[PDB]
Design an enzyme around this catalytic site. Structure first.
Site, PDB file in Angstrom:
ATOM      1  N   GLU A 162      21.566 -49.466  -7.668  1.00 27.36           N
ATOM      2  CA  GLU A 162      20.992 -48.625  -8.251  1.00 27.36           C
ATOM      3  C   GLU A 162      21.849 -47.476  -6.706  1.00 27.36           C
ATOM      4  O   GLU A 162      21.841 -46.292  -6.806  1.00 27.36           O
ATOM      5  CB  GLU A 162      18.892 -48.051  -7.657  1.00 27.36           C
ATOM      6  CG  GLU A 162      18.241 -48.599  -9.408  1.00 27.36           C
ATOM      7  CD  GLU A 162      19.110 -48.048 -10.748  1.00 27.36           C
ATOM      8  OE1 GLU A 162      20.388 -46.859 -10.811  1.00 27.36           O
ATOM      9  OE2 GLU A 162      19.045 -47.731 -12.085  1.00 27.36           O
TER      10      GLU A 162
ATOM     11  N   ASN B 116      23.546 -36.097 -12.801  1.00 25.19           N
ATOM     12  CA  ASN B 116      24.140 -36.201 -14.293  1.00 25.19           C
ATOM     13  C   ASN B 116      24.072 -34.979 -14.999  1.00 25.19           C
ATOM     14  O   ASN B 116      24.231 -34.036 -14.909  1.00 25.19           O
ATOM     15  CB  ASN B 116      22.546 -37.144 -14.867  1.00 25.19           C
ATOM     16  CG  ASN B 116      22.320 -37.799 -13.979  1.00 25.19           C
ATOM     17  OD1 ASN B 116      22.574 -38.911 -14.070  1.00 25.19           O
ATOM     18  ND2 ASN B 116      20.396 -37.731 -14.179  1.00 25.19           N
TER      19      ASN B 116
ATOM     20  N   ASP C 149      23.158 -34.177 -17.471  1.00 23.17           N
ATOM     21  CA  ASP C 149      21.971 -32.687 -17.945  1.00 23.17           C
ATOM     22  C   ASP C 149      21.401 -32.343 -16.862  1.00 23.17           C
ATOM     23  O   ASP C 149      20.480 -31.206 -17.187  1.00 23.17           O
ATOM     24  CB  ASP C 149      21.000 -33.502 -18.557  1.00 23.17           C
ATOM     25  CG  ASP C 149      20.247 -34.370 -17.823  1.00 23.17           C
ATOM     26  OD1 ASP C 149      21.044 -35.008 -16.526  1.00 23.17           O
ATOM     27  OD2 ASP C 149      19.166 -35.449 -18.344  1.00 23.17           O
TER      28      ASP C 149
ATOM     29  N   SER D 235      20.204 -32.403 -14.583  1.00 25.30           N
ATOM     30  CA  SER D 235      19.741 -33.460 -13.251  1.00 25.30           C
ATOM     31  C   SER D 235      20.005 -34.510 -12.701  1.00 25.30           C
ATOM     32  O   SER D 235      21.175 -34.137 -12.697  1.00 25.30           O
ATOM     33  CB  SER D 235      18.366 -34.258 -14.367  1.00 25.30           C
ATOM     34  OG  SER D 235      18.795 -35.415 -14.961  1.00 25.30           O
TER      35      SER D 235
ATOM     36  N   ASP E 181      19.448 -37.843  -9.782  1.00 24.42           N
ATOM     37  CA  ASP E 181      18.857 -38.778  -9.623  1.00 24.42           C
ATOM     38  C   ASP E 181      18.902 -39.147  -7.662  1.00 24.42           C
ATOM     39  O   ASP E 181      19.536 -38.445  -7.125  1.00 24.42           O
ATOM     40  CB  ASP E 181      19.048 -40.342  -9.774  1.00 24.42           C
ATOM     41  CG  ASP E 181      19.736 -40.095 -11.467  1.00 24.42           C
ATOM     42  OD1 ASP E 181      18.885 -40.133 -12.135  1.00 24.42           O
ATOM     43  OD2 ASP E 181      20.414 -40.784 -12.218  1.00 24.42           O
TER      44      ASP E 181
ATOM     45  N   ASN F 146      15.004 -40.113 -11.185  1.00 23.38           N
ATOM     46  CA  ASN F 146      15.510 -38.821 -12.058  1.00 23.38           C
ATOM     47  C   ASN F 146      14.348 -37.213 -11.520  1.00 23.38           C
ATOM     48  O   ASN F 146      13.294 -37.047 -12.412  1.00 23.38           O
ATOM     49  CB  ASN F 146      15.472 -38.761 -13.231  1.00 23.38           C
ATOM     50  CG  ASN F 146      16.446 -37.715 -14.626  1.00 23.38           C
ATOM     51  OD1 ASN F 146      15.864 -36.665 -14.556  1.00 23.38           O
ATOM     52  ND2 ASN F 146      17.435 -37.580 -14.101  1.00 23.38           N
TER      53      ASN F 146
ATOM     54  N   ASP G  61       5.139 -46.737 -16.453  1.00 24.10           N
ATOM     55  CA  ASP G  61       5.288 -45.545 -18.048  1.00 24.10           C
ATOM     56  C   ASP G  61       5.121 -46.195 -19.564  1.00 24.10           C
ATOM     57  O   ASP G  61       5.041 -45.757 -20.379  1.00 24.10           O
ATOM     58  CB  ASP G  61       6.398 -44.682 -17.594  1.00 24.10           C
ATOM     59  CG  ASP G  61       6.626 -43.520 -18.471  1.00 24.10           C
ATOM     60  OD1 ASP G  61       5.407 -42.237 -18.692  1.00 24.10           O
ATOM     61  OD2 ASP G  61       7.297 -43.463 -19.311  1.00 24.10           O
TER      62      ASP G  61
END
Length: 129
Positions: free
Chosen positions: A35, A46, A48, A50, A52, A59, A101
Site C-alpha cells: 500500500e 483517486n 472520485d 478522494s 488515500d 481513504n 467494518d
C-alpha cells in the site's frame, strides 16, 4: 518515515495488530508494503476526488477529513494529516475500525490482490518479535 520491515512488524505488534480480528501480523506488514512501501508520508489521489493517506492508505471519503472530499464521513474522527505521522498510532487505531467494518482486510485492494492467500508469514520471518 520509511519503516524497515521488522521495525514495522514490532511497532504493529505493540499496537495490538497481531491477530486482530483474526489477521496475523504478516498480513498487516504485507499490506503496508504494497500500500505504501512502508512510507508514512505516502498519499495517492483517486478519481472520485478522494485521497488515500499513510502507511495503510486510508481513504478520505469515509475515514478521515482532509477538507477537500465532498460527502466525506470522517469515521475515525481525525484529520487525514494525522495518518502521515511517523507515529503509526492513529493509522493503527483507524485500521482497527476499518477491518471491523464487516469486510475484513478486503478493504485494502493491495492486500486482496497481493497478500491474500500467499505465505504472509514470510513478511515477519527473521524478525526479533
Amino acid at each position: 518515515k520509511v519503516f524497515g520491515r521488522c521495525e514495522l512488524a514490532a511497532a504493529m505488534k505493540r499496537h495490538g495488530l497481531n491477530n486482530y480480528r483474526g489477521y496475523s501480523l504478516g498480513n498487516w506488514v504485507c499490506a503496508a508494503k504494497f500500500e505504501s512501501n512502508f512510507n508514512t508520508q505516502a498519499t495517492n489521489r483517486n478519481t472520485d476526488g478522494s485521497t488515500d493517506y499513510g502507511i495503510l492508505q486510508i481513504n478520505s471519503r469515509w475515514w478521515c477529513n482532509d477538507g477537500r472530499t465532498p460527502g466525506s464521513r470522517n469515521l475515525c474522527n481525525i484529520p487525514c494529516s494525522a495518518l502521515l505521522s511517523s507515529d503509526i498510532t492513529a493509522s493503527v487505531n483507524c485500521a482497527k475500525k476499518i477491518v471491523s467494518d464487516g469486510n475484513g482486510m478486503n478493504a485494502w485492494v493491495a492486500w486482496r490482490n497481493r497478500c491474500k492467500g500467499t505465505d504472509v508469514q514470510a513478511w515477519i520471518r527473521g524478525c526479533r518479535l
